[model samples]
Target: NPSVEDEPLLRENPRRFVVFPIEYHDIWQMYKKAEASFWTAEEVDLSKDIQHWEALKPDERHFISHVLAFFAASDGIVNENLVERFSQEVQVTEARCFYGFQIAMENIHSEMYSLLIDTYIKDPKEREYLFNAIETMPCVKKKADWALRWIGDKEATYGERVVAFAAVEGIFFSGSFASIFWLKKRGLMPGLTFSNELISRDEGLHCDFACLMFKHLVHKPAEQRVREIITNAVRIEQEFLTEALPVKLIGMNCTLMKQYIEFVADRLMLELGFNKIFRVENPFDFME
Candidate 1:
């Protein structure tokens, strides 16, 4: 229904009390699982990561800073979008419940980044600079603009809005997964990476819910637009990756990150009931 007020509180109608039925059991299950797996950033001890940070080469340190900058800023963006955009617009209580969980998780991620910065980034002034790096980083700016363009469009359809959500959870965050792998490959920042791995597991659940939402919201006619969005998102993320890690550090290079992007895009496409857009094997499957 275009107007939620025009629709029933429950999708099923029998003049009963408003309650969540098993209408979206998959989403409900995912939400339940997420709650059970709940964790705070404080649970991750970064003392070892502090030592790791001190030993990093200049280039490695620079690259890791940029990585944290993007994750920190972008997760904040995603958290706001979930609260202001998705949760407000969703008519289903189950879907909104899942969004609420995701919002909390995003905040945890933001806190995790802060924990890393405060613990590892020694110079207080340098800490402030890293916080603002997302604002200055060209790739982060472009990615943010692209996501906000669609997500902020009031005139867009529900299908388009769902696709925008996919772009954030499925596409934009893939870069962080790459960064985790980049660090893990070289055995850097074990505590930070371990916490990041937990975050990635949470995101994997998020992707499942997003996929379910997209499949439920989009029909055959809207499939083309979904595909187009996926394609455009791939292009934008590719450009972002190229600029974000132009000169790669040991065990992690631009080429591997690009491959990771394709690998994720393909899996996301398949998750959304579409054919693979880019059929590349996961380069970091060994880590999985």
Candidate 2:
């Protein structure tokens, strides 16, 4: 007798829509390898970028330091809160394994940038400024905690926690991660070029999984339930974007920041089977 929507015999696990392979065991191994190697001393680049930090134009230097500091704060928060909390709540077996690996990777990223401060910066005051900003940056993990706990509670429709976490994956991290790549693309910093690539890869996997979970969540409930999650996600995301990208915040006021966040939200929203949140006319140029 047919059962479970005529699901196929699981031969080698065929639900591989992401950049990562579907092999459960192999994915876990890659995730671990990625985490350990992410911040090894061997990976440090003793190159032109670090040597010439003082010579960079003021705007370039200001923006670069701001971006790095923002990421440092962000990584510390995610590794501590979002990733750790999700590991505790991931109901699925295989998904929890990946989330575990993601946590390891983000922790390494936090440490890696901390080392970047020690290895590169010459001025104690500047270094202290950057480190303090990372150490004290607020509202990221806290608001996220509230969102996840509220959404993931069993009493909530479609389980709000996944919706909240997915919003972070789709909207928050995507914006910041893409901005890192854009900086590298423009030759902003050689150090972040390497770190950003690794971080970017892990984030891509997380976002992919988040999209899958959203797709499955919508599949289970009625149309109204689907709309509920999407609508709530959009609202939370709007509030987060407003707070996160505020003009007064570091890395928040940049033109690039606005462009990347909006682009990422729209892309993830559409990919996860929702309408676009923003009009993305030119992928390359924000003004166009």
Largest lDDT belongs to which candidate? 1
TM-score of 2: 0.64
- Residue-wise C-alpha lDDT for candidate 1, range 229-254, written one tens digit per residue: 87788777766666656535544567
TM-scores, one per candidate = 0.88, 0.64
> Could you give candidate 2's per-residue lDDT for residues 90-184 as a string of tens digits?
44445556666667777777777776766666789888877876344443444445444543365653334555555555555654455555556
**CA lDDT, every prediction?**
0.74, 0.55
Candidate number with greatest TM-score:
1
Error of 2 at 130 (Å): 2.5
Flag regions of model 2 displaced more than 4 Å: 1-41, 44-48, 82-84, 134-158, 218-259, 285-288
Candidate 2, which ten residues in sequence have the lowest lDDT sum? Answer: 2-11
lDDT of 2 at 1: 26
The segments of candidate 1 whose C-alpha lies over 4 angstroms from its true place after superposition are 1-21, 218-221
